[PDB]
Amino acid sequence: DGVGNASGNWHCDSTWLGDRVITTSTRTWALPTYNNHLYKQISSQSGATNDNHFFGYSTPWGYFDFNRFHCHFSPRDWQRLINNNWGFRPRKLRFKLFNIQVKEVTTNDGVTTIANNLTSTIQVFSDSEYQLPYVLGSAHQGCLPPFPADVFMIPQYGYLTLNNGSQSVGRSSFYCLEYFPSQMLRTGNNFEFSYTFEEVPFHSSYAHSQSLDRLMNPLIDQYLYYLARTQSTTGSTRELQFHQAGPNTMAEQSKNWLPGPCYRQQRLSKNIDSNNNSNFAWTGATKYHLNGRNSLTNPGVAMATNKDDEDQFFPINGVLVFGKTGAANKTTLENVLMTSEEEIKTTNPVATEEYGVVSSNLQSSTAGPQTQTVNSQGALPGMVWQNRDVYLQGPIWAKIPHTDGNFHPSPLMGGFGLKHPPPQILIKNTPVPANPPEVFTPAKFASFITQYSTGQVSVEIEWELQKENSKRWNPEIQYTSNYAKSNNVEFAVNNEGVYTEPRPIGTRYLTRNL
Prior knowledge:
structural molecule activity; capsid protein; eight-stranded mixed sheet; 514 residues; six-stranded antiparallel sheet; T=1 icosahedral capsid protein; 33% strand; virion; Capsid protein VP1; Empty Capsid Viral Protein 2
């Protein structure tokens, strides 16, 4: 198109069409110049702890990130979804950039003047072949604002490569994004992209109405026998007694399935008075060892946050913790929203409890039986489990690493695991040299006109809906807003125009038989 012709329209809504829902989100974005158009090698400081060493590159490119459910679902749409479906999955994606405006900024005597540069371009391209490092599945900031009215800054792209301490190795890879084909857009140009999600399992948008330890009929006995006593009742000399387990001995009944794998985490009380007086946030945390580096298992394997009547206890680093609006990068428990995974109490072990006890020796007339606690149990035949719940403010998808093998490639932070996820969309402002010297100089250029860009970005996602088909008689639990009077409406703006999300909403409100 031309300067005076709009390259697109604001499409922001949600349409429900039975088994599928299409959400269109339109946002206004601003992209500055990053790194002064330079690729910069970045690494950890000298004083950094060995666990925090890194080596990589920060690039002059920006990237678009919409890997959060609140980018696409409004609170009302999220409530409509979670309250009426047993699951959902992303199906199709359309991406649009339009109404691009490149603006030149000139500073004179501390006065900033912004003018239109009608001939400047922006470079945009999608890494459709996944040849670049993927950073969209790391719960980084810089997403599309939940509120359509808010204007967001496009985050700076960067990546990490193999590092030995603060140094690089011969296998370290440097990527120049200018080596890729790129679409160049002036003010009248727009960019379009389409993507199809791979077949993935539906997210479990339900809780279990039964526990894996209570799948039997509570009226009949079992025809199998279990050893109920190794010693005689009255005269406790010796014997082997076998009983048929029944309703009164539900714990001793034979069963076909086992709770899911465990990786034990330290328990912490929301009431600080009940916590030990020491700094064990790191020394007492649950970690994995990789190439001599300790890394938190945050949030780690999907486990129940707490057991019945223990909502005030949470795993030390096994829960997704969001921040309230206006919360600083560092704050206390009062300014953060802690998710709860208690719905998976039915199948998953509690994050802060043991998996069980196993025999550790052989008993005899002289050696008594001995058991040891299992604080980390891997996959066993007959195991069943649920994944972490997804949240309106949580991530949608994570890229499955390209490895020889994997076990249940479901992201631990939650969401959909994709071998070929939505490709990264990288955007940059084309460097605009300032007036060059009148005599040729081979020196690398370092004088550019300060420029930034603004535009509209549209993301349309089609999700397939799994409709609940329960025969349950009594009313189900639903997500609802509080009818009590309040100073501010929930999920709205305040007197200052700040949009707040007061609590994290999961998806598991409806129930399903185990």
